[PDB]
Amino acid sequence: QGFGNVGLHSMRYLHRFGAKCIAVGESDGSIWNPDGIDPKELEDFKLQHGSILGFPKAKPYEGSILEVDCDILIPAATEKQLTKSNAPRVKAKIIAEGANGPTTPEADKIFLERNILVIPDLYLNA
Amino acid sequence: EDDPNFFKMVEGFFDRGASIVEDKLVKDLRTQESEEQKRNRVRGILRIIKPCNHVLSLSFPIRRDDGSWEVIEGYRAQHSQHRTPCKGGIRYSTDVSVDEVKALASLMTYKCAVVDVPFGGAKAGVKINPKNYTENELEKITRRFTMELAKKGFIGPGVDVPAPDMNTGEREMSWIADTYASTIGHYDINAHACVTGKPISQGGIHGRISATGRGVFHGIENFINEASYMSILGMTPGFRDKTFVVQGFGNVGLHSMRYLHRFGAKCIAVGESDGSIWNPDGIDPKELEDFKLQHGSILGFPKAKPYEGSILEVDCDILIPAATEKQLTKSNAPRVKAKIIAEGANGPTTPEADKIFLERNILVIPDLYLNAGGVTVSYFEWLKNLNHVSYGRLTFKYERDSNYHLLLSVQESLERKFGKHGGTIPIVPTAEFQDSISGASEKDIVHSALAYTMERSARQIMHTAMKYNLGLDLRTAAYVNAIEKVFKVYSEAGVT
Amino acid sequence: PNFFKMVEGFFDRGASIVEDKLVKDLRTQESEEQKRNRVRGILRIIKPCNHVLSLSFPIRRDDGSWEVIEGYRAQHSQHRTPCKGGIRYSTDVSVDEVKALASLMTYKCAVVDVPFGGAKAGVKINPKNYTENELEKITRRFTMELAKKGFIGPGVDVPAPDMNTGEREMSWIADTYASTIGHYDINAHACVTGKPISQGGIHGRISATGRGVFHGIENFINEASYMSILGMTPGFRDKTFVVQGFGNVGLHSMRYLHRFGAKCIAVGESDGSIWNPDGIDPKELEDFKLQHGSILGFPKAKPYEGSILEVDCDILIPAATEKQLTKSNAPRVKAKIIAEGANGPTTPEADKIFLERNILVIPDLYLNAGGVTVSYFEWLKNLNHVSYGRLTFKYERDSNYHLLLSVQESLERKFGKHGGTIPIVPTAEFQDSISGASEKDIVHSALAYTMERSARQIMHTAMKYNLGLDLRTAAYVNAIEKVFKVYSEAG
Ligand SMILES: [Cl-]
Ligand SMILES: [Cl-]
Ligand SMILES: [Cl-]
Ligand SMILES: [Cl-]
Ligand SMILES: [Cl-]
Ligand code: NA
Ligand code: NA
Ligand code: NA
Ligand code: NA
Ligand code: NA
Ligand code: NA
Ligand code: NA
């Protein structure tokens, strides 16, 4: 979530070790492809047009990027993106906070109840 | 694309059945007036049954666990009260609306008339998501919702009897019954009869879990065994050598698959919102139930290959939709392969898909008859709470001893005719009979009455389908029977 | 020697045994530590009486005098409404005892699957110093004070006869409620059981408790798994029993045990004891006591001096007062089965003495529940406003004759006319049943079904928890578990 500086290198090193990026979402849209998205192709596409909207090898995702059925969710955009509203609908089991405080303390309570691993920002985002 | 709103579909179903049955009502009316006032009274009463008579929109507060205060929107629509009390379910979803609960309350009236259940149509709904609230917050939501309904005459043993629905179960009904019995209805001797679907310790009836699934089995049983209908489908009567496919392995689909496989049918494919499994030589319901209960889903079944195609388009003989509204659609109707569509859910077929299913000689058993097994048993649970007794508690051993006396009487009579000089002619119950005698319980009486209801209601729909010659359009035949029954109570009651 | 409130210990030791099981079955969205707290909490509510009413109402005696009468009514649990219990007319009544007896009724109803809450009343008078007209005014005024404060009603509290009360008092109670507070109540006559038949009573009620005791011994005397530990052969064949106290429970328990092969060796009372090893007849002893006032001087049995509970036999049926078999006379007991025909006639000290002696003791909350089970049927009868079988008897009679004739005409069609006719007729026992089909036949059948089903529930947890021959703990374990599930599944 958020194809910025952190989000660009996050998907590149995960894709290098066998992980498949199924969706990338920013403030102006979200793409989706369950068969993987090439980080290099999306990086060159983000540079050319300043946005990931309209990626050829992907499809537009008209929904919440944080609620996509997946395994790892990497919030790497703005603050407080996972609150008590959308957190009970998160399908991921691992949440890697690529930003500074993107999960409310109330969402931390139900994330621990739902058995969802939340790697904290003061360690992972360092 | 195609999909309309369910509120539009039910009104269209009523308008179709009312125009057909109108001529029968103007002639069977034995009032002392001319034929024009008679047709005016028939058309006048039909103008009353269609709209919901009472709708209650609520806005009650609650104190959450964190301390904050929230306002909960709720709805409760009473379609008709020609037979008190009303019956209906309570839905917990953010998709509820006035138009939603009004439609399903209208369907509840005609569904009860099909199975001869003497209740009016009702339906409830609150705009919450149970995953957002904790167990303690859902209790205070449910208890406060019961208080506001009681003060406004929308819940009560003789007023309105709620029931479980989407995202609600016996846990909520237990809270509903305990709230009414401890406050507004404390002086009511039948206070626990105010709601059905309760646990056994709270007054629930036995056989309620498998009630809807058994009704789906018994319903298609009456039509798969009728040679007059089965000749049009092009299939031999009976469940043997027949393949069925279930959409949605929830509660209805689980027991529909369990009871069909028990009587010779073979499950070929089972699909959900998670995926779809397939096996051309049969799927075991017990092995699938334990796999669904263990891993929380059905994907990865060891004895079933995955099926990435549409679950509704699987080639089979019987298709059982048991999930969401409007699953069979004008665009996907000409691509189905099953000859019988067993609607194990409320409104899973669009009227335009019903048109394609009719021109293709595809038998669709409507929802207001097939999805009425739980409603019928809920009527028995309501009667159980009024009787303050379990069925058979007073007669199980009395009928058992008389049954053994009848067999012993035949034995001693045959011994004095054929065994005068030694030997014995033992007259013992069959293996099928001893199971009924030994494991005799309330579930045996409830499921027997359920089968009797689905059987008698099937002959009512068949008799109407052949009177107006509707062919395989049993939906219209069902609404005609329901409209005629509700009109019968109105016309013979008088004015205000 | 004596003891007071053993019921509190019965609950305490039954709650500790069931606790581990109750946490496992708890499916609440809570943590297993918090779950163990709710198990502990619910038991803390069940144990004490929820409501206790103390009264002091006046009457006018026949001589124009005035008197103030003390009366109490303790409602133990209300997890199942209405409440059920008796009304005792005695000078020795106390709130501490009507509370304990109300708690016993709660667990007794749960044992026999009776959906009532425990209760019990008590008026502090000696009914001998009062006339029938004075006893009526006492009863009627007692009913109205219970009605005004919500301690009697078809769905609130259903009293019943007890010590020094009977059909006469219950008819006065029902007549008063149905003419005052419950005039608009359509089920006003369901406010109390034990009424006469003309007042809405049920058939088979007088022989209810006695028959319930017989089925209690029957379900255990014919089970080899428990007769082998006791060292006896299954069945009532060639068995002698002594009935302590020839009251209503003793007279009918004798009449039914005798019918199935049992022999009454002795029968003691509060003033004497008769003995005869050849066997005493219940009818011959019944008409004698009906003609006189006591069983003393019975011709067909020599007078027996000594403890009537220590007679050499096999099954002892104490159907008299409370706490008769204690630790003082516990080792001197000659019988092998202690069938509790009364409410708590055995102290816990004697319970451990009988347990180490391998002597079976049928608990009071099970064997002494036949009348309560039938009182539940009487309550349903007044709600149905019709007798059992009134709509069914002729329909069930013609069906049996249709079935027997169907087997007759089918076999004669298959075998022919030359071999003769094949008459199919009921048994002697069958035609006896169909010809005299009455409501009592249905009530006694449903009672035997209750005792048979409840015995299996006691035997199950007796071997599940390895309680051996201590059925009382198994009976309390089952009763506590049933009351807990209603509490836990209600919020
Ligand atoms: Cl989950
Ligand atoms: Cl139309
Ligand atoms: Cl067979
Ligand atoms: Cl009688
Ligand atoms: Cl004979
Ligand atoms: Na690679
Ligand atoms: Na928060
Ligand atoms: Na509460
Ligand atoms: Na009540
Ligand atoms: Na009940
Ligand atoms: Na024949
Ligand atoms: Na008889």
Which ligand is in closest contact with the Cα of C430? 5
CA distance B15 to B21: 10
DSSP string, B234-301: T--SSSTT-EEEEE--SSHHHHHHHHHHHTT-EEEEEE-SS-EEE-TT---HHHHHHHHHHHSS-TT-
Question: How far is ligand 12, taken at its centre, from the CA of residue C234, in Å?
Answer: 27
- Check B410 against C404: CB less than 8 A apart: yes
Interaxial angle between packed helices B6-28 and B351-359, expressed in degrees from 0 to 180 and rounded to the nearest 10 = 70
SS3 (DSSP) at B60: strand
Nearest chain C residue (CA) to B203: C486
Which of C387, C422, C489 to mutate against chain B (most B CBs within 10 Å)?
C489
Resolution (A): 2.9
* Candidate from B143, B389, B409 with C-beta closest to C430: B409
DSSP bridge pairs for A82: A103
In chain A, count H helices and then E strands. 4, 6
CB B365 within 8 A of CB B474: yes
* Candidate from B397, B406, B413 with C-beta closest to C448: B397
Question: How far is ligand 3, taken at its centre, from the CA of residue B431, in Å?
Answer: 7
DSSP bridge pairs for B305: B278
- Check B397 against C441: CB less than 8 A apart: no
SS3 (DSSP) at A24: strand
DSSP string, C77-92: --SSSSEEEEEEE-TT
Q: Which of B149, B150, B156 is nearest to B126 (CA)?
A: B149
Q: Is B485 annotated as a binding residue?
A: no
* C17 and C56 housed in the same domain: no
* B269 and B163 housed in the same domain: no
CB A73 within 8 A of CB A25: no
Which H helix or E strand runs over B91?
strand B86-92
| Count of C-beta atoms within a 10 Å radius of residue C359 | 19
Neighbours of chain A (3+ CB pairs under 8 A): B
Question: How far is ligand 9, taken at its centre, from the CA of residue C160, in Å?
Answer: 19
CA distance B104 to B7: 8
Nearest chain B residue (CA) to A90: B131
Nearest-Cα distance to chain A for B241, in Å, is 39
CATH value at residue C167: 3.40.50.10860
Contacts of C21 (CB under 8 A, 6+ apart): C481
* C55 and C33 housed in the same domain: no
- Check C404 against B406: CB less than 8 A apart: yes
Cα dist. C18→B179, C36, C40, C414 in Å? 28, 12, 11, 60
Tokens 């409760």 correspond to what residue? B76
CA distance A102 to A96: 10
SS3 (DSSP) at B313: coil
CA distance C4 to C97: 9
Q: Which of B454, B478, B449, B443 is nearest to B218 (CA)?
A: B454
Which of C84, C116, C424 to mutate against chain B (most B CBs within 10 Å)?
C424
Q: What is the token pair recorded at B467? A: 């009177």
The strand order across the sheet containing A94-96 reads: A72-73, A94-96, A117-119
**B324: DSSP letter:** S
Neighbours of chain B (3+ CB pairs under 8 A): A, C
Question: How far is ligand 7, taken at its centre, from the CA of residue B63, in Å?
Answer: 17
| Residues in C touching B414 (Cβ below 8 Å) | 411, 422, 424
Domain range holding B14? Answer: 1-53
Q: Output the CA torsion A60→A66→A68→A74 (10° steps).
A: 100
Which of C374, C427, C438, C486 to mutate against chain B (most B CBs within 10 Å)?
C427
CB B144 within 8 A of CB B70: no
Cα dist. C148→B103, C49, C83 in Å? 47, 20, 16
- Check B132 against A106: CB less than 8 A apart: no
CA distance C432 to C237: 24
Question: How far is ligand 3, taken at its centre, from the CA of residue B430, in Å?
Answer: 8
Q: What is the CA radius of gyration of chain C?
A: 24
CA distance B90 to B163: 6
Q: Output the CA torsion C207→C209→C214→C220 (10° steps).
A: 160
| Count of C-beta atoms within a 10 Å radius of residue B327 | 21
**Catalytic residue (choose from C120, C239, C336, C381):** C120
Strand ranges, E, within C288-346: 302-303, 315-318, 337-339
* B25 and B83 housed in the same domain: no
Question: How far is ligand 10, taken at its centre, from the CA of residue C127, in Å?
Answer: 38
**B88: DSSP letter:** E
* B58 and B150 housed in the same domain: yes
The DSSP bridge pattern shows strands B305-306 and B276-278 to be: antiparallel
- Check C442 against B398: CB less than 8 A apart: yes
**C189: DSSP letter:** G
CB A95 within 8 A of CB A116: yes
Long-range pairs of C424-428 with CB within 8 A, sequence gap ≥ 24: C424/B409, C424/B410, C424/B413, C424/B414, C425/B409, C425/B413, C426/B405, C426/B406, C426/B409, C426/C400, C427/B405, C427/B408, C427/B409, C427/B412
* B169 and B241 housed in the same domain: no
Query: What one-letter code names the amino acid at C25?
Result: D
Question: How far is ligand 9, taken at its centre, from the CA of residue C84, in Å?
Answer: 14
Helix spans in C81-166 (H): 95-111, 132-148
CATH value at residue C366: 3.40.50.720
- Check B132 against A85: CB less than 8 A apart: yes
| Count of C-beta atoms within a 10 Å radius of residue C348 | 16
Which active-site residues of B does the annotation give?
Answer: 123
Nearest-Cα distance to chain B for C30, in Å, is 9
Helix spans in B29-161 (H): 35-49, 98-114, 135-151
SS3 (DSSP) at B483: helix
CB B194 within 8 A of CB B181: yes
CA distance C328 to C309: 13
Q: What is the token pair recorded at C40? A: 């502990």
String of b and e for B453-464 (b: at least 16 CB within 10 Å)? bbeebbebbbeb
Contacting A with CB below 8 Å, chain B residues are 66, 129, 131-132
- Check B394 against C426: CB less than 8 A apart: no
Cα dist. C198→B35, C84, C176, C186, C319 in Å? 55, 22, 16, 17, 29
Which of B94, B131, B136, B297 to mutate against chain A (most A CBs within 10 Å)?
B131
- Check B131 against A89: CB less than 8 A apart: yes
Contacts of C44 (CB under 8 A, 6+ apart): none
DSSP bridge pairs for C123: C71, C89
Burial tier of B293 (Cβ tally within 10 Å: 0-12, 13-18, 19+): exposed
| Count of C-beta atoms within a 10 Å radius of residue A29 | 16
* Candidate from B143, B388, B412 with C-beta closest to C380: B388
* C347 and C268 housed in the same domain: yes
- Check C430 against B405: CB less than 8 A apart: yes
- Check C446 against B417: CB less than 8 A apart: no
Strand ranges, E, within C300-370: 302-303, 315-318, 337-339, 360-362
Which ligand is in closest contact with the Cα of A109? 7
* Domain count within chain C: 3
Q: What is the token pair recorded at C405? A: 């004739």
The residue out of C161, C184, C199 marking a domain boundary is C199
Nearest chain C residue (CA) to B175: C490
Nearest chain C residue (CA) to B200: C486
CB A66 within 8 A of CB A72: no
CB A95 within 8 A of CB A111: yes
* B181 and B318 housed in the same domain: no
Question: How far is ligand 12, taken at its centre, from the CA of residue C440, in Å?
Answer: 9
Angle at C208 between CA C206 and CA C214, to 5 degrees: 130
Nearest-Cα distance to chain C for B406, in Å, is 7
Cis peptide before B321 (omega within 30 of 0): no
* B260 and B309 housed in the same domain: yes
- Residues at Cβ < 5 Å from ligand 4 ion: C 203, 440
Cα dist. C255→B342, C250, C335 in Å? 60, 9, 19
SS3 (DSSP) at A114: coil
Which H helix or E strand runs over A80?
none
* B308 and B414 housed in the same domain: yes
Query: What one-letter code names the amino acid at C46?
Result: I
| Residues in B touching A88 (Cβ below 8 Å) | 129, 131-132
* B47 and B63 housed in the same domain: no
Nearest chain C residue (CA) to B135: C29
Output phi, psi for B339, to 5 deg. -90, -20
- Check C423 against B412: CB less than 8 A apart: no
Contacts of B17 (CB under 8 A, 6+ apart): B476, B479, B480, B482, B483
CA dihedral (B194, B195, B196, B200) positive or negative: negative
Which ligand is in closest contact with the Cα of B8? 2
| Residues in A touching B132 (Cβ below 8 Å) | 84-85, 88
Cα dist. C22→B282, C18, C194, C274 in Å? 40, 6, 36, 49
Question: How far is ligand 3, taken at its centre, from the CA of residue B257, in Å?
Answer: 22
The residue out of C174, C199, C224 marking a domain boundary is C199
Contacting C with CB below 8 Å, chain B residues are 134-135, 139, 143, 174-175, 178, 181, 187-191, 199, 201-202, 387-389, 393-398, 401-402, 405-406, 408-410, 412-414, 417
* C207 and C195 housed in the same domain: no
